[model samples]
Target chain A: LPQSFLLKCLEQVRKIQGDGAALQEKLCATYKLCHPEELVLLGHSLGIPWAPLLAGCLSQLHSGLFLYQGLLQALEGISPELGPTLDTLQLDVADFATTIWQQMEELGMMPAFASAFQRRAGGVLVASHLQSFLEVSYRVLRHLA
Target chain B: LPQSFLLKCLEQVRKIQGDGAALQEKLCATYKLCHPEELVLLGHSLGIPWAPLLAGCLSQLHSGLFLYQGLLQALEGISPELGPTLDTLQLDVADFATTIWQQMEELGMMPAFASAFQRRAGGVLVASHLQSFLEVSYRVLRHLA
Candidate 1:
């Protein structure tokens, strides 16, 4: 992987970490949402997806790992480097995402939901949907790390 | 400079190029905007910032170069590289932007107008405003080349 891309991901994770913490803070203070599971129905009404944990960040967690895999795939396409690192980066992150989901469920958190993400031309994801997906990934990286 | 960063920039320029070309094509076909200068008042009404050419792409041309220079500068901060190319890249693009402005004026194209861009946190140019500014630079590069 390009160090630049890795660094960008790291920075993005940091940003997500801060935002997720802020979100958790506000939910606890203002809305009495101390745990993510408490936000389940709200997530469904607001379109947060479900996954391993039911209504928690677990929903898009693996999707975020897949997104990283996609980015890493593109970077790998730019030029092949070490096979081990290239192959493992996405897989490793996916492993971590799954681990996070497991932890959430065992600890009694929430999971994923059903969201209708519209497809645009050329099989590409863009803009708003990507942001939401990325936020899930970011939260996963933050909490997972 | 990292080849990855440089390549990413080239890719961005191409995307902007394609989008600007599409916008130009639609304008010419549907709204009769034969020259960009003719779009001046509409741009003013739409809030395109003026720079060198009054209402023309000249307005954001240098801004785009500045944007490039900013990106280049950030990349340079990642690691010190060859001084000559690093120093000249921004200057050279600026020269190109200026040349495009002169060409527009000589060709009787439009110039710029006043725009009030709101300031946001920590001195970041973002989202919609950045997209418009980038569009200007893209057109300059496409036509300048």
Candidate 2:
């Protein structure tokens, strides 16, 4: 939880808060720059797997079973090119998180916050379908935690 | 400087950090939502003055030329229908800073480590826009010094 990271996170949110869609778009751009291929997977529109996973972890709103049909359709529509991007995104995420976390620790900013940034950014990526699959998103964090 | 407002800001940026088109689309959506007439005034294509404005404010680089042009067009394009929503969203950002700063003063976290959360958030927002408009961002923290 680097204080700087928290500040960055908070400020970023406020700048675009009023426009959820635009706010999401900026996130996608940053991810594309930092983790492009990752956005190809998860097919975020339906908000199926990631939504449910987030619901389970951060809220009580699980819709997996209810959204089964739409989820299947979404997977079917995904572009083939997105496949590798998704895989690489997951791999890169691991590398990225570890690198940032270690840097923060070295700088002495963790105890006051529990990896706040990785959690928030990573969480947003998960919701944005920037991963190949929600399971991978959850697994990556689980291991990191 | 309020922690809550800062938290809100980070959440917005996290939504579309590195993605390109998606981020653009969302920004446009927000502008349209905020000022429907801006959309109508801009018409259907890239020629619309508002397009550049949309790009300017949302641009991480913070180029004033584009933002200024866009805002000018936006004012001209205003529509009564969207006035209320736009008004709320457009609520003087300076006022937001002032109100939040007052709250921080009440909490007296403005000068200490516990207040670090508010500081970082404000710092980053100031930071993100500083490269282009450095003076304005720093003014937010003029009292802190």
Candidate 3:
């Protein structure tokens, strides 16, 4: 008997959560952008967007993970320990993306895929933005735990 | 009245170089992957790819910049001083991209627009890979300086 890959992503989500948390901590220490609530407005000023909550919707989470995957590549190398986990996390998330799309096709679900740029200073601001972004996304998922 | 945007990009490339060099230094100190020559083998092991050289071909440079743009997003928050510069730099480069694409359409330059995954552990290794990646790409353009 084969375990459904669709069901298997539940396992992938569980694994990605730990790696995501590890990178989130790496951002916290490196940028001091610890409090997402306190930092929300500043990130808004930069036009940065948040990752979709990974709670109930697979389709939403698919789009959300696409955003995170792009951002993760953006957030690459924030921590040494979170390094390979970074690559694998995306690989898993993207794999989860493909799996979700497959199920979407077999269902009534529609497929979609999604960028912008602005000129600004980004050093701590970007990390803080990333930190806050991950904080909320992860916070929601953690609650699912 | 205004300089050709194409020619002006010469100036943009010059500006991007300094900020890029600064970030490269940050990676060097943080990851000790300074010698890209020595590090190339390791990056190859990860199946990491390099940015297109920013020399000679406008089409090549455009695609190269796209690669760098995505990668830069991946490399966000590597330094404090480069924070705003990071955002600004991409805006400028993307602007350069738009300018090039526009001119390409006007001048009979064909407008053609264009991922794989491996799971791996990445910390220092990713940065090292990024280091070498930037090293050669930047190295090529830096020669123009």
Candidate 4:
């Protein structure tokens, strides 16, 4: 494992977490939203796809990437002031996904992007990190409403 | 100068630059605006402070920080679809500012945050990097309009 890369990844994860929290606070305060759960139905109505959290590594990564992309699409026209923030967060999340996928490739745990959809691995760390980011993103959207 | 930190900063700066370029493209495609110079007057009216490019290290950093912060403030409610992207970019710029300031402190070039505004150093590389970001940001906003 690349310690420096891992350290940087962890640092970015925390930074995103903190930034997400602050964004949620601002959205909630500005939009008068208080419940994230209530937005689930709204999310579905808005075409936001929910990823299967218990899937294998490849599935998880695939779904995780899909979820963020879908979320970005769904967030269109939410708030003018929030656009740059969303783009930055989405790009970082995408970058993190790339890092994990590349690491998996180097480990010989996966072969090619198309074939990655079906592979299974014991590494659950990446999945969990992605899940946490997704959860925060869901909450942020809710607050934005 | 810590080469590791500078290397990381360069990586992040490049990442943000790419993201900013993509954002500019999106805004232009969607909004049909192309000239950034046209928005300079509007930016001035919005009270966006222009940072001096030839200042010393502390002034450069401070001005760079001020420029990005001003850009964020000036971008308030520019595009509903672009909010998260703008916020993410703003946060990254702020993070970069913190990174440079912290490194300066570690090198005994500065004392602390309270007196950060009054110090000067000879570094110009960081300032130019920040300038590039600001220029791209200006383009992004103009396209957004």
Measured over the true interface residues after superposition, the C-alpha RMSD of each candidate is: 17.4, 14.4, 20.4, 14.9
Query: Per model, how much of the real contact set is kept?
Result: 0.00, 0.00, 0.00, 0.00
For every candidate in turn, the CA RMSD to the true structure comes to: 19.6, 20.9, 19.5, 18.9
Candidate order by lDDT, decreasing, is: 3, 4, 1, 2
Scored by lDDT, model 4 comes in at 0.44
Per-residue lDDT of candidate 2, residues A1-145 (tens digit): 2233332322222222223223233444433323323533422332324334422332211132123223222332123433333333333334334444444456554011123333223334443443223333334333333
Taking all chains together, the TM-score of candidate 1 against the true structure is 0.25
- Candidate 4, residues A54-126, lDDT tens digits: the string is 1244446545665655554444424667566556656766776676567667766511112211111101112
DockQ for every model, please. 0.02, 0.03, 0.01, 0.02
DockQ of 4: 0.02
Error of 1 at A72 (Å): 7.1
The C-alpha local distance difference test score for the whole of candidate 2 amounts to 0.31
- For residues A22-94, write the lDDT of model 1, one tens digit per residue: 3233333433433444334443444322223134444455555555445434433221222333354345445
lDDT of each: 0.37, 0.31, 0.46, 0.44
Model 3: lDDT equals 0.46
List runs of model 4 lying over 4 Å from the truth: A1-145, B110-145
* Best prediction by TM-score: 4
For model 1, the stretches where C-alpha displacement exceeds 4 angstroms are A1-58, A64-145, B1-7, B10-62, B65-120, B124-145
The better candidate by TM-score, 1 or 4, is 4
lDDT of 2 at B53: 17
User: Which docking band does candidate 2 fall into?
Assistant: incorrect
What is the two-chain DockQ of model 3? 0.01
Residue-level lDDT tens digits of model 1 in B1-145: 2222222333343333223333233333333333443343454463433233234445455455565455434423221323333344345445555654555566576112122121111011212233345444544443443
Report, for candidate 3, the interface RMSD.
20.4
Residue B40, model 3: lDDT of: 49
Worst 10 residues of 3 chain A by lDDT: A110-119
